[PDB]
Each structure stands twice: as C-alpha cells, then as structure tokens.
Design a protein around this ligand. Structure first.
Ligand SMILES: CN(O)C(=O)C[C@@H](CCCc1ccc(C(F)(F)F)cc1)CP(=O)(O)O
Ligand SMILES: CN(O)C(=O)C[C@@H](CCCc1ccc(C(F)(F)F)cc1)CP(=O)(O)O
Ligand SMILES: [Mn+2]
Ligand SMILES: [Mn+2]
Lengths: 410, 410
C-alpha cells in the first residue's frame, strides 16, 4: 500500500486529495492515510480521523490539543499518536512508515514542512508554487544533499508536463536537479493558461477593471489570491519560474499559450520536435492522484474525456502589453539570483492591494517593476541555514519596498 | 551507432527514412545505413548507394542485377555485398551487423521480409498495416517464438499511441504481446483521422464520387491505394484492427475520431482517465525516426510546432452511414478468426475496382460485406507454417470471391 501523509488536510489540496483517495480505495485498497496535519480545525480533523483512521494526528495550535484528544476518544477501535506543533510535524516526517507527503499549506509553513520532508528522504507532493519561486535555490540544495528525497509537482500544468515525460528517463534523475531536461530529452515547454477573465479587454478597459470583475463568476471557483493572479496572468508568470526550476528548462524555451477550454493542461516538445500533451477536464484530482501514484497509474471512476463533445480546442499568444506581469516574471527569472523571490514578495503585496481596491490593474505591474528595479543581486550563501535566512530577509525587504511605493503615491 | 536496413528504400516510407537519417546524421553521427533493398529501381538505388554507402545492396528483380553491379563500380572506395531476390533479403535479415529493419514494402514481400526479420530477432519498424490486419495471428505466434524480436509501429497513429506510453512499462512487454494494454495501464484509444477527401459530402454527392475526386488536389502526397482507403475510411477501419493487434486493446475501447487539422495524431486514455496525446505537423519523418530511436529520442532540425499559428483543433465522430467501411472493419475485428484477413483481401479488390472506375463508392462496402457474409470461420492452425499457408489461402479465396461478385453484377 501507498502510505501517505496529508499536511493541511482541511484545505483545498488536502480535501481533494482525501476525496480521490476515498474514491480510488473503493475500487482497490491502494492508499493508507497514515497522518493528518492541520492548523486549528480540530472538528474537521476529527471527522477526517473518523473516516481515515490515520496512525498520526497533528494539530499545529497547541491550544486545541486537549480538545482533539477528547474528540478522538469517541472513535472506537482507534488509538492514534496525537502530536502538536512543529515538533509533531517533524516526528511525522521522520516516521519510516510514511512514504509520501502532500503539502497543501501556503506561505512559509509550507516551505518549512517541505524542508523537513526532504530532510527525511520522502516523496513530497508539492502544490505551493510560491515556495518553488521564492526558495528554488534552497530546495535544489536540499535535494542535492538528500538524494532519495523527491518533489513531485501537483500544480496542474506542471503535473501535465511531468505526465508527458518518459519514466524510464525520469527515474534516472528527479525534479529540481541540474540536467533534468537533458536526461528527459526536453526541448521546449508549452505552458497552457486559461487566460483569466480579462483576456479580450482593451488597454483602456484594463485601466479600470476592479477586483470584483476578476472575482465575478469564476470558470473554476478558487481562492482570491490565485484568482487575482489568474486575472493579471502573474499566475502563469510564477508558473514559468516554477517550470524553469522543476524541469531545468531555459526561459527562452518556455512559451505561455492561452487555451481557454482548459482541456490540454500543458505540452512538452522533445528534441526531435515531437510534442506530447496531457488532457482532461479541469479537475485537480488527476494531478493530485498522479503525484501519489507516480511512477504508476491506478483505476479511477472519473468521467471519461469526450473529445467529440468537447469539439474545439483553441490556442493564442498572450499579449505582454495587456498582461505585463508575464513579462516581469520572465525578466526576473532570466535575471536569476533572488529576483524571483522579489517578484513573488512584491506581487503578494500588489495582489492584496488590488484585491482591497487600493490600486488599479496596471499599478500591480508598476509596483512589482519598481521593486525589481530597486533590488541588487546578492552573493548566494553556501550555508543552507544562511541561505534560508537570506531568502526570508529578501522576501521581507521586497514586501516592505512594495508597501513603501504604495504609501508614497497614496 | 544505430545500424539500419531499409526495405523498399525508394518508396514513400523508405525515402522519408533516408531523409530523416540524413538530416539527423548532420547533427550527430547516429545511424549507419547498412542495407538498402528495392524491387527494380536500379538507378535510384545506385544514387542512394553513392550517398549512404551501405554494406549490402539488394534488388528483387534479377533482370537489373548485372546493371546494378556495373553502376556501383563508379563509386569510389566501395565494395558492397550485392544481392538479389528473396534470398538476398534473407541474408540481410540474418546479418549480425544489422540491428533494425524498416519495412517499407506493400503486398506479400512486406509480410515475407517482416517474417524473416522477426525470425532473426531484429527490431522491425513496420509501416505495412495490411500485414498486421491480415496476418496478426501469425505475427503474434512468431513473436512468441522469437522472443527478442520487436515490432515497432511506423503507421503515424500507432506511432503516436506508442509515443504516449511510458517506456518504463513498454520495456516490460512489446507490441503484439498479450497483456500489452494491461501492463501499460491503457484504458481506451482515440484513433485520429483526417476524415479523407469525402468527409463533408452529402449522401447524394457520395453516390456519384469517383476515384478522380479522391486523387485530385490532395491535402498531402500519398499512394493511390491508401488515398482510396482514406476516402472510404477503410484506412481507419484497417487501423482499428491494427490497434487491437498491436496494443491488445478491446474493440469497444477504440474510438475513431475525425481531426481534420492532422496535428493530434492519436490519444491514449489511461485507467485513471488521464489522456496523453502526441502532436506534430503531418510529417511522416517523426514516426519513422521514433521507430529507429525508441526508447530514446534524438535531435532533429524539423520545424517546431507553432500551436498559436495552428490556432484551432477540431474533433467529430464519423458517420457510419457515409463511411460503412468503418462499421465493416469493427464487425470483422469483433468476429475475429480470419475475418480481418477476409476484410483486407476483399477491400484490396474493391479498392482497385473503384480506383479503375469499375464500381461506385457504395459498391465498395457492398462487395466487402458480401465476402464477409460468405466466409466460414476455420480452426486456427497451431503450427506457424500451417498458419501462414492458411492465411494465404483465405486471402486468395477472398480476393477471388470479391472478383466473382463483381463479375456476376457486371
Ligand atoms: C488549475 N491551476 O493549476 C491553476 O493554476 C489555475 C489556472 C487554471 C484555471 C482553470 C483550471 C482549473 C483546474 C484545472 C485542473 F483541475 F485540471 F487542475 C485546470 C484548469 C488559472 P490560469 O491558467 O489562468 O493561470
Ligand atoms: C498518415 N497516415 O498514417 C495515414 O494513415 C493517412 C491518413 C492521414 C493523412 C494526412 C497525414 C499525413 C501524414 C501524417 C503524419 F505526418 F503524421 F504521418 C499525418 C496525417 C489518412 P486518414 O486519417 O484519413 O485515414
Ligand atoms: Mn497552475
Ligand atoms: Mn495511418
């Protein structure tokens, strides 16, 4: 059986992971959910524990630890190891009974748990694209040291790319390693984008779009931060950098393409110019499942793709004048060093300012551009601990700079 | 260095094979063309010999054998082994200096050379779909005896399918082996079709179509027989049976889909319902190249696919009323036994009758249907030589039966 831990089990990735695990386990007993980890949703964790009966339970907030203990007594024939905080997370990571960890936690705590999963030579199913963009150097360093640790991408486009690769080649290397693209014969990547809600608007129309316009009737309903990033196409920008780090593909060989039907999830061009693509309805269960079954596939009861019904698939180039966040992402990535950290941090501030109606659409890219122009390359620490501190300092600096730019003009 | 023999080196498959070998070798010396075999095109073979300098030359037609020997004296520093006929073909297949054999011959000499390549445990790049459809049983039996022989598909759709599979799984099985689909986690196949030159005709327009209409202003350049098969969609009918035999996919799990843009070459749905597809411009060099590089890929200088420029990809279900040959192919495949042999043989006659303006469009399917109805299933011979003779007998019977049906109605 596949022994899986779910970190952030009540979030979007965590619940979709448990859903597909549930459905697949009805067809064949494939997964043992060995651990669940949440911040403070003690009741939701209890309900999950009642169904999945994991060996480990962990709650980050120590204040609800005793409440969890008492709730779990209601479940019969069940004596779990109940843990608290960072120390509990670390103990789960060190368990030789856990094979794979799904990290569905946002921000630093996602990176922190990823770090410990890697340090224990686990397979890490990673959805947090901001952690790859911001701390890619650090992750690459850790993966070079901990040879059996692997990051498997869960972001749908990156899963699609990963699914397009020959595992006879993938098994000779791993993601976030030098020469990954050479070993896999990768020439170029088509990174498919929905294009977001503003995809046909004029420059003058874009001047006055609000966050309500971005958040109005989503094609796929998702969190506010990513929805704003989808509207500016900074989501794709971040994903370009993620692609570069995960697959060691040069920026000149990554093309963003707008595919509004969201059936083709991305494509890989190999060195012979043959192109392989992965296709399905827009359903996050496939990328999550593949991250847990790789290098194998298992049966699901998901609806089969009806291509004749789908009927038409369309592709066009995004306009970088209309979606300048894409250009800024490429520029930051190509500059290298900690520019991607700066891009991510300044976008965090600009995204949130636009979300709360404090700035306009082109102010997002304006602020990010100014923060990038103010950053000076730093010597990259050789010490792993100093490197992590360096990333956090630069992240903090960039957020402050974005905020100061906003404060000067307001 | 990949040591290759090309059988039928002046036909379409052969010349495209030599073109891509030439272009790839300019990038990196990967291929040695060890042998070239033609029927009677002695001057063309000489010109190829002058460039590629193969160890072996073979010409089927004894009457130009001496002319070939005299022509080859003009080539500097070159002492090839110059051979004739079936015996020359057999000697090439048995050479320890040949790894891979491209079968670019139609008719029987195709099946005949395929057999000898398999008997010598070679990798056989097989383009002749009629051979698989007609003698699939025999090929399976032979591959079970000669366990190191492998058939690698060159037919573009079947290459596409093969390219969509994980070689970590493919390497544990082989084409035309029982359980190929199970080992590769294949659930279903989308077999993509151009739709042919008659795809948009009304029923009334179809009743009056001639071979001239099929052969005029082609979308892509190809032979008369296959062009007629594309027009009736019997080409796709044959390819359904080819798919079943190559990949051990059930007929209920093979779907023919009309994709008029000819960019997606076919798709594989896996047991999780994830779909993988292979895409390129319609250029036969990719499938030929992959058959020779599998399980690896090599660099080419082919034009990269510009998806944005392609812009739109479309899919629809073919009409079985307009294209009854598709239905007849499924029926023959599902009934099994030697019905595919009968389908292929009767089609050979009906195709040629329509080509030469002797019968009308719907007479093609009428004749094939009548021959299929006439056939009586036979006990499948256990001995492989007895089985080959049985296939040949049934093939001859079915051609004669089709011909007699024509002669009665004429
Ligand atoms: C899903 N995903 O990984 C995203 O980044 C969101 C993306 C796609 C939204 C639509 C969608 C949702 C889910 C999926 C799924 F389920 F296949 F992952 C595909 C497509 C927005 P954009 O491409 O404009 O940057
Ligand atoms: C190419 N091929 O394998 C055919 O069977 C001919 C096919 C496709 C003709 C156009 C074409 C030519 C070459 C290629 C290539 F490059 F993929 F080989 C794809 C498509 C006709 P239909 O699908 O209607 O039965
Ligand atoms: Mn994504
Ligand atoms: Mn074909």
């Amino acid at each position: 059986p596949i022994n899986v831990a779910i970190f952030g089990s009540t979030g979007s990735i965590g619940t979709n992971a448990l859903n597909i695990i549930r459905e697949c386990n009805k067809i064949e007993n494939v997964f043992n959910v060995k651990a669940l980890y949440v911040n403070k949703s003690v009741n939701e964790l209890y309900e999950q524990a009642r169904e999945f009966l994991p060996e480990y339970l962990c709650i980050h907030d120590k204040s609800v630890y005793e409440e969890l203990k008492e709730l779990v007594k209601n479940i019969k024939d069940y004596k779990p190891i109940i843990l608290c905080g960072d120390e509990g997370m670390k103990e789960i990571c060190s368990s030789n009974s856990i094979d794979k960890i799904v990290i569905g936690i946002d921000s630093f705590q996602g990176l922190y748990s990823t770090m410990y999963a890697i340090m224990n030579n686990k397979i890490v199913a990673l959805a947090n694209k901001e952690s790859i963009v911001s701390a890619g150097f650090f992750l690459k360093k850790l993966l070079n040291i901990h040879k059996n640790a692997k990051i498997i991408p869960v972001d749908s486009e990156h899963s699609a790319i990963f699914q397009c690769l020959d595992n006879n080649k993938v098994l000779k290397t791993k993601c976030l390693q030098d020469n990954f693209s050479k070993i896999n014969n990768i020439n170029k990547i088509f990174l498919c984008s929905s294009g977001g809600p503003f995809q046909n608007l004029t420059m003058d129309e874009l001047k006055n779009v609000t966050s309500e316009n971005a958040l109005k009737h989503p094609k796929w309903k998702m969190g506010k931060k990513i929805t704003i990033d989808s509207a500016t196409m900074m989501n794709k920008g971040l994903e370009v950098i993620e692609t570069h780090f995960l697959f060691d593909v040069d920026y000149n060989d990554i093309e963003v393409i707008v595919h509004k039907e969201c059936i083709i999830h991305s494509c890989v061009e190999f060195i012979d110019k043959s192109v392989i693509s992965q296709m399905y309805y827009p359903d996050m269960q496939i990328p999550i499942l593949y991250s847990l079954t790789w290098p194998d596939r298992i049966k699901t009861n998901l609806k089969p793709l009806d291509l004749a019904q789908v009927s038409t698939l369309t592709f066009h180039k995004p306009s970088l004048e209309h979606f300048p966040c894409i250009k800024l992402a490429y520029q930051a990535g190509i500059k290298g060093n900690f520019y991607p950290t700066v891009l991510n941090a300044s976008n965090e501030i600009a995204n949130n300012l636009f979300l709360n109606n404090k700035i306009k659409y082109f102010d997002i890219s304006s602020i990010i551009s100014q923060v990038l122009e103010s950053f000076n390359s730093q010597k990259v620490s050789e010490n792993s601990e100093d490197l992590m501190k360096q990333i956090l300092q630069i992240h903090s600096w960039a957020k402050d700079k974005a905020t100061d730019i906003y404060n000067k003009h307001n």
